[PDB]
Amino acid sequence: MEGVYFNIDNGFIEGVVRGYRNGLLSNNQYINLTQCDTLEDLKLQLSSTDYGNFLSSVSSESLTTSLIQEYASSKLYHEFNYIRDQSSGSTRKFMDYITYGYMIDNVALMITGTIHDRDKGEILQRCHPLGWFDTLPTLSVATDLESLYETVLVDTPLAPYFKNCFDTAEELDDMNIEIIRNKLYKAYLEDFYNFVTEEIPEPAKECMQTLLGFEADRRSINIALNSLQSSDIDPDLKSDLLPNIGKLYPLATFHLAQAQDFEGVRAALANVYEYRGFLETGNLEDHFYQLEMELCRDAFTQQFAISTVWAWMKSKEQEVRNITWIAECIAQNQRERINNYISVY
Amino acid sequence: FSFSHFLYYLVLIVVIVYGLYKLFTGHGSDINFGKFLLRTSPYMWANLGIALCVGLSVVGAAWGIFITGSSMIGAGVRAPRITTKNLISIIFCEVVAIYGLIIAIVFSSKLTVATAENMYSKSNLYTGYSLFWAGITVGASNLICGIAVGITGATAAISDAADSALFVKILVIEIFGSILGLLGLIVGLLMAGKASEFQ
Amino acid sequence: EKEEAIFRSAEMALVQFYIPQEISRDSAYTLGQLGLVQFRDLNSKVRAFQRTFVNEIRRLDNVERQYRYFYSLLKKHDIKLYEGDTDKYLDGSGELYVPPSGSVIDDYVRNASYLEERLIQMEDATDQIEVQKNDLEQYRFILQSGDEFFLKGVNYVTGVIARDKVATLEQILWRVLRGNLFFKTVEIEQPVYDVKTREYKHKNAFIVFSHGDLIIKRIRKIAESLDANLYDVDSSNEGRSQQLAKVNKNLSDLYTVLKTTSTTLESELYAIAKELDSWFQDVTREKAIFEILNKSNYDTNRKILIAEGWIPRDELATLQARLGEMIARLGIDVPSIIQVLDTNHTPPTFHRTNKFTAGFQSICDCYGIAQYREINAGLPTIVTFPFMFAIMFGDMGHGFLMTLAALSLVLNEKKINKMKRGEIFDMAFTGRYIILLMGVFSMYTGFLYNDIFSKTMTIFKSGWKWPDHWKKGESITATSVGTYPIGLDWAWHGTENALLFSNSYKMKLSILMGFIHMTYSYFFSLANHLYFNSMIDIIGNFIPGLLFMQGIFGYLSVCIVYKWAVDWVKDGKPAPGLLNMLINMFLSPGTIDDELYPHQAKVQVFLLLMALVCIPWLLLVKPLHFKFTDFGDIMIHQVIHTIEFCLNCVSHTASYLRLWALSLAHAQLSSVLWTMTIQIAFGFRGFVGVFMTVALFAMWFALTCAVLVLMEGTSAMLHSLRLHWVESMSKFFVGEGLPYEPFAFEYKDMEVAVASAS
Amino acid sequence: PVVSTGKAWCCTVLSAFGVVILSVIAHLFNTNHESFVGSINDPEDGPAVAHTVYLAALVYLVFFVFCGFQVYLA
């Protein structure tokens, strides 16, 4: 069984991340945060949680909605960097593969910001400190891709993912950079699924396979619903943007690659059982966040598994989205939709 | 390439070809496992039983101790009050080796010196066989018991760090998991009950 | 008059306080200067931002935030804090002083708010000079480099980059310029302290030669995107002379501007560094009293706060005798502001510890806080905990070294309890009477085991006699001419069967001491059940549990002691194996290999049958008395208590064999260390052998003081601790309780509060 | 001198226990004791090996008075 060899190098990590799980805000703590009047009341009410004394040394009057999520994210990222420094062998590779997906978003953000002639220093902020890679600010030169890959991207770990990307030889606009980002993310999800299948042991293997399948399915549905808009894409040129894994791959990605209107997407998801309750709703991303949280809650029942390191990392990032949504309503007096946070724990 | 599997397949090929050679030559009774059991000294079987009993019991205790101890130190960074509460999870893993001490104390009283004639008799061969398999039985049962109680102790430490009202309900599984080593002790003391010393 | 509360807990009382609002801030100091009231939270289920007295907390911890900023600003400019060591004008005798009154706290608040913006506008103006000092200091390094650094085939870029990024620049500029680069670099041996980041940052210079206009403008962007500081340098040597004479003369000017700007800030920090500590103590005592009134009710119709608090009942004559003094100070006749209330909550525990029981009580409190008015566990631990250590550490010589290491901490208590210890020497100092008793009992036990530094003593006459004569090398035996009065006989020393006799004694000693210890711990359960008036716990748990383990494992101890008292050679009967009849009492009942006493066969069957009727008499009488007055909360708990009480009898009585094991291994290592280090030097008569025994004695003494006293005295101490936490307190110690910890004032020590916050 | 805080005490304690133990060992080799001289594989000459232990006691006494003054400087 799995507990025999797991705790030789991952027992301290397991115990620390389960203790990190225990600081997730339950449903009553969000109600107590919702009842706050001003933002100092939100600070006092968050001081009685496992965030406690993190907005110390700020002010009583320099407290802003942006600053709250900056500090609440920096806490999360220091915790991730603490767990990754205590890992070795296969867990270190697992956490580097978690990091690469943020590196891709930093790459697309830097290339997009270079085109619109703006400052390098303002693209270097708002640029997600977890996927850093020290040679990143060198991407602000030489606005075509062939002078990017041949100078700075071959040394990055994103270098194997630029295989399907060299069909243009010109400069870049907002459409081409999103095509490059979707192709990089396809190659990333397929390589990380292949790493999970061949090298992670079983109770974490099946959990990470269903979590990465959910990530691939959400990418596929959003690429299909962002391609029926004011554009014209050949249907075999769109099947190169959909990842080859998940539970809607071998049939429904054939139909999503050919959907011409909004009713072609509802017809493609009508056959899959876990979906087709999603396209008649309020928000569409509030189904994906809810289903991701029900998947992450189910991953905390497996006790000897490193999927927990995923399931914590996505849950805590949901939590920082909730607090901001409360802090955007207290600072702006918009209490009408304040109870639309997403809470499972 | 699975080099150890290649070693396994080479051993199997050599065994099958050798036995088939002995059949077809006409000498299949030269591979005589019963004559090996009468010419081998009973002191070998008795001392392998004692040594493997205490060694395997100690190995199972140590395995269970690091399985429960790693998670108990990791779950004590945020909840340091679980430490002295969950110490009996380690106590259940460490009484596995005291059973191996007890078996090695009982069985070592039967290691007397036999005479040159009256050496490979029925009683001495019986005592060697009984001490060998009794030592293996209690040592293997204690290895299995120690690893199982260690897994349950790690899970109980995680559950105690979560909610303190859960440790009373996960402690029941460590009580079920610890009777296995005591049953191994009882069968080890009963397999060597009628065995005399080496007179 | 005042009770002792070391056998059981002290008697508590819940006290209600009706405090007027005009003396609410005043009486909180009176109840804080006497630290013997534990308040309880009456405003539960009220959110922390909705309680009263929350604006005062926000103002006072804004002041605490600013004081932490001041202490952090006393770093980077090494200025020591004042540390007024008069810890006497606040805490001490009398337990009643005068607090600062309102306007002093407001002067603290607006002084700390006035002085923060002063230090920010002086600390930013000093810090802006450093970033234009390091730039010109490293640009002065470029201008003194000779001619070979500036000459190799504008046509070059020059700058300073971190040493982390030199290989990255050279690799990127190799891939850009297609292998036609002329990169060159020289190191800088001193670290350049930056302010953007806050490390030391080994940097070095670089120069890149290329001819072009797009190529220079792209190499420049690549270089400055890797955080290199680029510079413009003339090509002629007169150009470097003019730039070294022009950029310098500004470094000395900027040094003069760096002083008298880093000097008034320096003097202001010297002004703040005096009496910052007293400010911090006053502000934290003010916030401490406002967090006690925060958990008490307040009426609106009448001007009355209502609080509850736990107090030891023998000190109800002290709240009245101090609050009368407080009212007599400022005369306002108030109507009976103390009332003793009857309750049905759980009061705290509070054992009084008086400096000799204190370390033993700290040892027993690491396991759990006792129930209210339960028998204390720290009172038997004064003797049994250093004496179970002594059996595992039975050496007359090592106990002498442990007493001498204990008396160098007891004979000077006053010098050490007023200095910092540091987490190992602290546990050595607070557990010094434990080490004293452990060493004394080690002397007694090693006198009975008859070994001093693995050598015997020979201080009586033996009970063994050797034959009259023999040939040199004959296996003789002794003749048993009597018995030996105290301890082991010294005629068992070499003897080639010393471990054959010497560990049948040491195995039975452990079983007897473990049985007597557990049966003494188990009567504390009867003494608890007879105090709390729980006559069903006597007949439901105590009596079957007593007849279970006394009918199995007490019979074994009677059989051990009786077999020693019978002469099995003068009588002509074979001595039976006690372990053999112990196994055959359960696994083959009725039969007897060798008869120990004349009616042994009926007693084995009666004691086996009695111990099997205690399995239905436990687990069944206790729940049914609940039903006929089952529920599941009682039945399943009693099933777990029964199959955990049984199966811990055998496990707990077998866990005491570590007494034998650690003693045997201690004696064996101390005997091998003698015969391998100091025994070698006894055969070296000469001049080389005088030096040889000095070195070999030094090695012997170092290993017998480090390996053999310290890290085996630590092992033998933590196995005696387990026998008290597990095998002793699983029979009387019921578990969970509430610690006392009243509301008092203490010195706060800012460095344990600045690192504790962020 | 020497460090005289962690190096003088570390030699004075070792030399103080070096005089006391080696003196009684040399005394128990001077008189035959059957524990120090009682075996066939054991020093034979008796009070001849008391001399070479007594000289080491004197050498440790020399170290004791030499390092005992070096803490007396302060």
What's the distance, Cα to Cα, between the start and end of chain B in Å? 53
Q: Which class for C28: exposed (0-12), middle (13-18), buried (19 or more C-beta within 10 A)?
A: buried
* Residue in B77, B147, B154 closest to A19 by CB: B77
Q: Do chain D and chain C touch with ≥3 beta carbon pairs under 8 Å?
A: yes
User: What contacts C443, CB < 8 A, 6 or more positions away?
Assistant: C396, C399, C400, C403
DSSP one-letter string for A20-59 = HHTTS--HHHHHHHHT--SHHHHHHHHTTSTT-SSSTTS-
* A307: number of Cβ within 10 Å: 24
Contact A186, A104 (CB under 8 A): no
| Nearest one of C370, C369, C352, C348 to C14, comparing CA atoms | C348
* Residue in B72, B74, B157 closest to A16 by CB: B74
Separation of alpha carbons C365 and D14, rounded Å = 38
Residues of A in contact with B67 (CB under 8 A): 3-4, 7, 11
DSSP one-letter string for C367-391 = T-PPPTTPPPSTTTHHHHHHHHHHH
Domain residue extents for chain B: 7-192
Architecture of domain B7-192 in this structure: Up-down Bundle (1.20)
Residues of A in contact with B157 (CB under 8 A): 15
Long-range pairs, C59-66, Cβ under 8 A, ≥24: C59/C109, C60/C109, C60/C283, C60/C286, C60/C287, C60/C290, C61/C287, C62/A60, C62/C109, C62/C113, C63/C108, C63/C109, C63/C112, C63/C283, C64/C280, C64/C283, C64/C284, C64/C287, C65/A56, C65/A57, C66/C112, C66/C113, C66/C115, C66/C116
Can you give the C-alpha Rg of chain C in angstroms? 40
Separation of alpha carbons C347 and C417, rounded Å = 32
* Residue in C368, C587, C655 closest to B98 by CB: C655
What's the distance, Cα to Cα, between the start and end of chain A in Å? 29
Contact C18, C304 (CB under 8 A): yes
Contact C294, C30 (CB under 8 A): no
Residue C305 backbone zone (phi > 0: left; psi -120 to 50: alpha; other: beta) = beta
Separation of alpha carbons C139 and C203, rounded Å = 12
Q: Do C725 and B84 touch (CB under 8 A)?
A: yes
Domain residue extents for chain D: 1-74
| Nearest one of A166, A170, A165, A160 to A181, comparing CA atoms | A165
DSSP one-letter string for A183-229 = HHHHHHHHHHHHHHHHHS-HHHHHHHHHHHHHHHHHHHHHHHHTSSS
How far away is chain B from the Cα of C478, in angstroms, using its nearest Cα?
23
How far away is chain C from the Cα of A150, in angstroms, using its nearest Cα?
7
User: What contacts C330, CB < 8 A, 6 or more positions away?
Assistant: C23, C26
Q: Do C647 and B179 touch (CB under 8 A)?
A: yes
Separation of alpha carbons B166 and B168, rounded Å = 5
Q: Do C654 and B95 touch (CB under 8 A)?
A: yes
* A142: number of Cβ within 10 Å: 18
Nearest residue of A to residue C218 by CA position? A141
Separation of alpha carbons C743 and C288, rounded Å = 9
What's the distance, Cα to Cα, between the start and end of chain C in Å? 48
Q: What is the largest CA-CA distance in chain B?
A: 73
Q: Do A135 and C218 touch (CB under 8 A)?
A: no
Chain breaks in chain C (C to N over 2.5 A) after: 153, 629
Helix (H, G, I), strand (E, B) or coil at B195: coil
Nearest residue of B to residue C581 by CA position? B193
* Residue in C456, C682, C698 closest to D49 by CB: C682
* Residue in B63, B74, B78 closest to A14 by CB: B74
Kindly list the partner chains of chain A, i.e. chains with 3 or more CB atom pairs below 8 Å: B, C
Distances (CA, A) of C340 to C16, C29, C317, C427: 6, 21, 12, 40
CA dihedral A122, A123, A126, A131 (to 10 degrees): -140
Structure tokens that stand for C370 in this block: 């006792």
* C729: number of Cβ within 10 Å: 20
Measured in whole angstroms, the distance separating CA B122 from the mean position of its chain's CA atoms is 27
Helix (H, G, I), strand (E, B) or coil at C414: coil
| Nearest one of C539, C543, C552 to C611, comparing CA atoms | C552
D39 touches chain C (CB under 8 A): yes
Can you give the C-alpha Rg of chain B in angstroms? 23
Distances (CA, A) of A288 to A85, A224, A249, C159, C282: 31, 15, 18, 51, 54
| Nearest one of C511, C496, C464, C468 to C483, comparing CA atoms | C464
* A101: number of Cβ within 10 Å: 16
Helix (H) or strand (E) holding C12: strand C12-20
Residues of B in contact with A303 (CB under 8 A): 155, 158
CA angle C703/C705/C706 to nearest 5° reads: 65
Place of tokens 């033996």: C462
Residues of B (139-168) whose Cβ lies below 8 Å from A = 147, 151, 154-155, 157-158, 161-162
Helix (H, G, I), strand (E, B) or coil at C70: helix
Separation of alpha carbons C523 and C183, rounded Å = 87
Q: How many CA atoms lie within 13 A of B150 on its CB side?
A: 31
Separation of alpha carbons A22 and C644, rounded Å = 31
Residues of C in contact with A40 (CB under 8 A): 49, 58
Kindly list the partner chains of chain D, i.e. chains with 3 or more CB atom pairs below 8 Å: C
Separation of alpha carbons C699 and C713, rounded Å = 19
DSSP one-letter string for C156-206 = EEEEEEEGGGHHHHHHHHHHHTTT----EEEE--S----SSS-S---EEEE
| Nearest one of B69, B61, B62 to B153, comparing CA atoms | B69
Q: Which class for C608: exposed (0-12), middle (13-18), buried (19 or more C-beta within 10 A)?
A: middle
Separation of alpha carbons C234 and C236, rounded Å = 6
User: What contacts A220, CB < 8 A, 6 or more positions away?
Assistant: A242, A243, A246, A248, A252, A253, A256
Q: Do C647 and B172 touch (CB under 8 A)?
A: no
Separation of alpha carbons C635 and C618, rounded Å = 11
How far away is chain C from the Cα of D2, in angstroms, using its nearest Cα?
19
* Residue in B72, B157, B161 closest to A22 by CB: B161
Helix (H, G, I), strand (E, B) or coil at C101: coil
Nearest residue of C to residue B179 by CA position? C647
Residues of C in contact with B93 (CB under 8 A): none
Structure tokens that stand for C355 in this block: 């400096």
Separation of alpha carbons D74 and C14, rounded Å = 58
Residues of C in contact with D60 (CB under 8 A): 694
Separation of alpha carbons C51 and C420, rounded Å = 40
Structure tokens that stand for A223 in this block: 């690429």
D18 touches chain C (CB under 8 A): yes
Structure tokens that stand for A255 in this block: 């139909």
**What order do you get walking across the sheet with C203-209 strand by strand?**
C184-187, C203-209, C156-162, C229-231
Residues of D in contact with C702 (CB under 8 A): 14
Separation of alpha carbons A219 and A292, rounded Å = 13
Structure tokens that stand for C547 in this block: 């007849």
* A247: number of Cβ within 10 Å: 15
Resolution in A: 3.1
Residues of C in contact with D10 (CB under 8 A): none
Long-range pairs, A300-304, Cβ under 8 A, ≥24: A300/A21, A302/A203, A302/A204, A302/A207, A303/A3, A303/A14, A303/B155, A303/B158, A304/A2, A304/A3, A304/A6, A304/A7, A304/A14, A304/A203
Contact C31, C743 (CB under 8 A): yes
